[PDB]
Design a protein around this ligand. Structure first.
Ligand SMILES: CCCCCCC/C=C\CCCCCC(=O)OC[C@H](CO)O[C@@H](O)[C@H](O)COC(=O)CCCCC/C=C\CCCCCCC
Ligand code: 78M
Ligand code: 78M
Ligand code: 78M
Ligand code: 78M
Ligand code: 78M
Ligand code: 78M
Ligand code: 78M
Ligand code: 78M
Ligand code: 78M
Ligand code: 78M
Ligand code: 78M
Ligand code: 78M
Ligand code: 78M
Ligand code: 78M
Ligand code: 78M
Ligand code: 78M
Ligand code: 78M
Ligand code: 78M
Length: 448
């Protein structure tokens, strides 16, 4: 019968839903840092470029953090299908905010809308893909990999199309193209979902029982009161700058996995959960390096690369390109070697080493040529080729949304250290430190 690459026809609707949301997201993130540079250069935005880079990292940290609870809200309160739809609306509104004739005054409102919108949509589109397959269906893994190919496809074309529109027609037009991309996703999702999506997921699948509503409200109200109380105290003692608020979000993002480790401590399982700790830190450190490609590598591309004949935002397409080119090779690898199946602690060790090698490579051109001129774009290509190879090995998602959030929160502190005089030392020591910790994991692989 008629399938979508051997999968139920409903996969195409969700395939295109996420390709276009990822289009809006990574198109925005390819030009947002340069947009803040522009607002700084005109005097509209009164922050340093280091603070602007810090914003990008903590921006990514909250998006991943908000995705840790979007599954709860859909499953228990609103439903998986309304969560994707109203999440997509909030994402679209966030990009429309940046297309309006405003300046720095619209940055926070657009960031808030997209943080919340992506939390509703991103975990619940992945959930709805599973609802196309029963527990029995072997096609579940193949359908998810086809779904991920649409993720990288949207992430690939977005910097090319959005970045070119920025250079040709300006920032406001480019940001409006991001909003249009999400709108395209909403059209296909709404009308397409109604034709092929189970109406069971228009409602929550585990709705709150009558006695569950009150303690959930108390839990939510206590967290909001405490967080607000901290901001109140911060203003009375004088810790009230933008970096101070960024530092607050950094601490909250890192304290969540630490507190969930500190008292989650049954010798049955107490040490087989201490198991997962040397690998959660390996994932945090890999994700930090990977997410600096949109920040530090975006800075290097605009400052240290002879790229005069094409938009510098296009470098952000190298990340999802290498994911697409590596994927069929590794699918072959994980089945061609039916009896190798290297252990997950070893893959995470070697994966972190490749990420460290990606930064070690970027220390060479500055050390060899100096930091005052410009070098070939192939240095950045080699860097992304090495860090994505580390991703192919590391291949509840909220926990994986979490290590992404903490690594990005760690970036909000480190990326302020990067500049022209910092370049070689920055790349050489965060790359070496990541490689040494990857070898330390080798010594402890199944010390577990
Ligand atoms: C069948 C797949 C095999 C692919 C693995 C090989 C990696 C692919 C390409 C490596 C190309 C080597 C670099 C070429 C070179 O040396 O540059 C020559 C060029 C002459 O015009 O000049 C320079 O001007 C440049 O300025 C000098 O600087 C460097 O070349 C430093 C290069 C950085 C080190 C890279 C060395 C080896 C990479 C091997 C990675 C293999 C990893 C596979 C898992
Ligand atoms: C998606 C971004 C990847 C871009 C990869 C580009 C690979 C180019 C390699 C050659 C180095 C730059 C050569 C400069 C050049 O030839 O410009 C032509 C001439 O006008 C000099 O400016
Ligand atoms: C307008 C200012 C607020 C912006 C909204 C940002 C909300 C972001 C994050 C709140 C979620 C924090 C709780 C996440 C959490 O603890 O889950 C982790 C747990 O699921 C691990 O699996
Ligand atoms: C209108 C307000 C903005 C939109 C509301 C959604 C804001 C995001 C989260 C609100 C908290 C809901 C409860 C989430 C929660 O308890 O997470 C627990 C965690 O274990 C999830 O697995
Ligand atoms: C700024 C835009 C305002 C909102 C415009 C869109 C609201 C118009 C009609 C409400 C549609 C709600 C549909 C919610 C939903 O679950 O859709 C899921 C989709 O699969 C269709 O069932
Ligand atoms: C329980 C709540 C957890 C913490 C969630 C709070 C996250 C809310 C907002 C994060 C936005 C990051 C900072 C945005 C920003 O600095 O842009 C505004 C700035 O350009 C104005 O000068
Ligand atoms: C389909 C509904 C949501 C999709 C977005 C619809 C609106 C998108 C674009 C409309 C025009 C964008 C405004 C462009 C703009 O004003 O900037 C250019 C100009 O101000 C600078 O010279
Ligand atoms: C200044 C630019 C306009 C700003 C407002 C843009 C809102 C325009 C249209 C809202 C699109 C709603 C989501 C698209 C969709 O497919 O919804 C279908 C559903 O509402 C039909 O019942
Ligand atoms: C930051 C502002 C957030 C405002 C909205 C957050 C609300 C969070 C928790 C309240 C959940 C109460 C929902 C009750 C509900 O819908 O179920 C009712 C029914 O199932 C009980 O019999
Ligand atoms: C539940 C216990 C509450 C105790 C307080 C919890 C939060 C403690 C400190 C939050 C500090 C916010 C970030 C630190 C900060 O403001 O640094 C200021 C500095 O960057 C210049 O203003
Ligand atoms: C999440 C629960 C509701 C919290 C209500 C209060 C939220 C206030 C701030 C959240 C963190 C965002 C901080 C970014 C910011 O406001 O920068 C302002 C900047 O001008 C500093 O002067
Ligand atoms: C008993 C609980 C375990 C032991 C407590 C461990 C500390 C818990 C949370 C602290 C989070 C780490 C601090 C965040 C951080 O490293 O950045 C600091 C920076 O943002 C301040 O400028
Ligand atoms: C298989 C890897 C190929 C070689 C990778 C090892 C590269 C080691 C160092 C990068 C080239 C160093 C350039 C020379 C240098 O940095 O010294 C500069 C300094 O002595 C001048 O004051
Ligand atoms: C070949 C694949 C892996 C790529 C990494 C191989 C290169 C390893 C390390 C290169 C870093 C060399 C650092 C040289 C250096 O810092 O010199 C200091 C001085 O020249 C600049 O301040
Ligand atoms: C798996 C792939 C590993 C990649 C290995 C790392 C190779 C990275 C950079 C090689 C730099 C060579 C650049 C020299 C070049 O061809 O252009 C000349 C330059 O002057 C033009 O601007
Ligand atoms: C097991 C949980 C994983 C935790 C990973 C994060 C490691 C904990 C704390 C990292 C603190 C980084 C502080 C960065 C720093 O101080 O330097 C940058 C600073 O100069 C920016 O002003
Ligand atoms: C010598 C340390 C043990 C070797 C472990 C192998 C690690 C992988 C590649 C070699 C990295 C060399 C980094 C060189 C370095 O850190 O120099 C820093 C430079 O800024 C000072 O000149
Ligand atoms: C065990 C978990 C590791 C996670 C955090 C790893 C890095 C922590 C702190 C780094 C901040 C110290 C800054 C060291 C430094 O000087 O680097 C900057 C230098 O490369 C350029 O000037
Ligand atoms: C300056 C030297 C640069 C190259 C050094 C990197 C290679 C040297 C040693 C790597 C292997 C060290 C021993 C690791 C090992 O096999 O531990 C046993 C472990 O596999 C069992 O879990």
């Amino acid at each position: 019968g008629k399938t979508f690459f051997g999968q139920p026809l409903g996969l195409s609707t969700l395939f295109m839903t996420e390709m276009w949301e990822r289009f809006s997201y990574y198109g925005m993130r390819a030009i947002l840092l340069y947009y803040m540079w522009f607002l700084i250069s005109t005097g509209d935005l009164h922050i340093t470029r280091a603070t602007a880079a810090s914003i990008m990292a903590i921006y990514a940290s909250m998006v991943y953090l908000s995705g840790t609870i979007g599954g709860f809200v859909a499953d228990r309160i609103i439903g998986a299908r309304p969560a994707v739809f109203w999440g997509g609306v909030l994402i679209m509104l966030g990009h429309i905010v940046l297309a309006l004739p405003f300046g720095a005054s619209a940055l926070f409102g657009s960031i808030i809308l997209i943080i919340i919108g992506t939390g509703f949509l991103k975990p619940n589109v992945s959930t709805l893909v599973g609802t196309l397959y029963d527990e029995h269906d072997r096609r579940r893994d193949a359908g998810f990999s086809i779904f991920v190919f649409g993720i990288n496809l949207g992430a690939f074309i977005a910097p090319l199309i959005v970045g070119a529109a920025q250079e040709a027609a300006g920032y406001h037009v480019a940001f409006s193209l991001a909003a249009i991309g999400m709108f395209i996703g909403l059209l296909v999702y709404y009308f397409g979902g109604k034709k092929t999506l189970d109406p069971h997921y228009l409602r929550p699948t585990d709705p709150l029982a009558p006695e569950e509503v009150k303690p959930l409200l108390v839990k939510v109200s206590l967290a909001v009161a405490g967080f607000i109380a901290i901001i109140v105290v911060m203003n009375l003692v004088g810790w009230n700058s933008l970096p101070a608020y960024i530092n607050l979000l950094t601490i909250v993002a890192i304290a969540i996995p630490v507190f969930y480790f500190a008292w989650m401590i049954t010798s049955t399982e107490h040490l087989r959960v201490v198991s997962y700790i040397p690998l959660f830190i390996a994932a945090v450190l890999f994700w930090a390096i990977e997410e600096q490609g949109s920040v530090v590598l975006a800075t290097f591309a605009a400052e240290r690369v002879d790229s005069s004949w094409f938009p510098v935002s296009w470098f952000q397409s190298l990340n999802p390109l290498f994911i697409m080119l590596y994927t069929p090779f590794f699918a072959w690898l994980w089945t061609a070697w039916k009896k190798n199946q290297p252990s997950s602690p070893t893959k995470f060790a070697v994966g972190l080493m490749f990420a460290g090698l990606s930064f070690l490579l970027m220390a060479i051109p500055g050390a060899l040529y100096g930091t005052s001129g410009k070098v070939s774009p192939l240095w950045l290509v080699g860097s992304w080729a090495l860090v994505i190879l580390g991703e192919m090995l590391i291949s509840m998602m909220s926990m994986w949304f979490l290590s992404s959030s903490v690594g990005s929160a760690l970036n909000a502190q480190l990326v302020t250290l990067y500049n022209a005089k910092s370049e070689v030392a920055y790349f050489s020591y965060f790359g070496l430190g990541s490689v040494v910790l990857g070898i330390v994991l080798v010594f402890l692989s199944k010390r577990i």
